[PDB]
């Protein structure tokens, strides 16, 4: 992963989806979020998960620079994830403010 986001540290405020997450022709998922915080620049926590209690990462994050570079509120960013097959969950953010969206990918 890029050091750029790591040195920013993780974004702490709440994210919100801006539109329904959309499948690509490759079966990956593109999901856009809006960030409520003013602590940018910061790194967007973004993963797929099947177990909401362990939050063990499944699939992978494709986005090369998953960051919010603006310090003004309500900035948007697009994440792209490679989901596992079957049912899973998009998980954006960390802690009590994280948001989730169910996802299903066929061809297990």
């Amino acid at each position, epitope marked *: 992963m890029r050091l750029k986001g790591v040195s920013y540290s993780l974004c702490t405020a709440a994210f919100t989806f*801006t*539109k*329904i997450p*959309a*499948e*690509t*022709l*490759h*079966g*990956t998922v*593109t999901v*856009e979020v809006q960030y409520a915080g003013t602590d940018g620049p910061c790194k967007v926590p973004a993963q797929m998960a099947v177990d909401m209690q362990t939050l063990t990462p499944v699939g992978r994050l494709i*986005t*090369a*620079n998953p*960051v*919010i*570079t*603006e310090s*003004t509120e*309500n*900035s*948007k*960013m*697009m994440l*792209e994830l490679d989901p596992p097959f079957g049912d899973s969950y998009i998980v954006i953010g960390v802690g009590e403010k994280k948001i989730t969206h169910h996802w299903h990918r066929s061809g297990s």
Partner: antibody, heavy 120, light 114 residues
């Protein structure tokens, strides 16, 4: 709010080269593509090409014969289109627009356009 | 390249009418992996940049009024305005979003009947 602010109107001589800019706000500049479009009266919209400023990757419509070059300054959230060997047929409004290749979200936010007039 | 054909180029309308705009592509805009048609519709008023209305052939961009409906698949697409209003008077473009180079139709202009 997502905004793309383009540079002011240009008056160029034939054979010259123009540098247009597009400064963005409201989103992570290095996370999306900038697409460049050409609109002149009598024609619809024509795609010039694209740059992904976070990487430098660029793609061009062959019809421009290599006369366009896209660059970016990520510290300014600015994308540039240079169009060289201008002719009167390059007189047009040029737009930049935000894009995410791989998605089908299409061209969702557009700059206000820069007018270019090419005349001797 | 993919050619986008809009016909007719102009259409005279009255407030409250149902209007259907046509758009045809030279080859299919369908990607079989996600079974989505990569077709977008834009609205342009004079002195303004185009505005995105519909992406993926049928999905309305946030904030676009519900009276705009995109439909169709493969090579034949339509934009329907169920009850046209005065603010809908504009030029409408469809766009090949399927593969490069991106290409656009020549547009259909809505004008007012009298």
């Amino acid at each position: 709010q997502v905004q793309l602010q383009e540079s002011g109107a240009e008056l160029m001589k034939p054979g010259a080269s123009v540098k247009l800019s597009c400064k963005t706000s409201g989103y992570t500049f290095i996370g999306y593509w900038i697409e460049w479009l050409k609109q002149r009266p009598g024609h619809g919209l024509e795609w010039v090409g694209e740059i992904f400023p976070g990487s430098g990757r660029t793609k061009y419509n062959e019809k421009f014969k290599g006369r366009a070059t896209f660059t970016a300054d990520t510290s300014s959230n600015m994308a540039y289109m240079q169009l060289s060997s201008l002719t009167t047929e390059d007189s047009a409004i040029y737009y930049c627009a935000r894009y995410y290749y791989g998605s089908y979200y299409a061209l969702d936010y557009w700059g206000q356009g820069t007018s270019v007039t090419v005349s001797s | 390249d993919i050619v986008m054909t809009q016909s007719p180029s102009s259409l005279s309308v009255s407030a409250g009418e149902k209007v259907t705009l046509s758009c045809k592509s030279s080859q299919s805009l369908l990607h079989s992996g996600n079974q989505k048609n990569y077709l977008a519709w834009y609205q342009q008023k004079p002195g303004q940049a185009p505005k995105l209305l519909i992406y993926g052939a049928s999905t309305r961009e946030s904030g676009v009024p519900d009276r705009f409906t995109g439909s169709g698949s493969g090579t034949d697409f339509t934009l329907t305005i169920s009850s046209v209003q005065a603010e809908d008077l504009a030029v409408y473009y469809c766009q090949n979003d399927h593969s490069y180079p991106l290409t656009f139709g020549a547009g259909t202009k809505l004008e007012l009947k009298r």
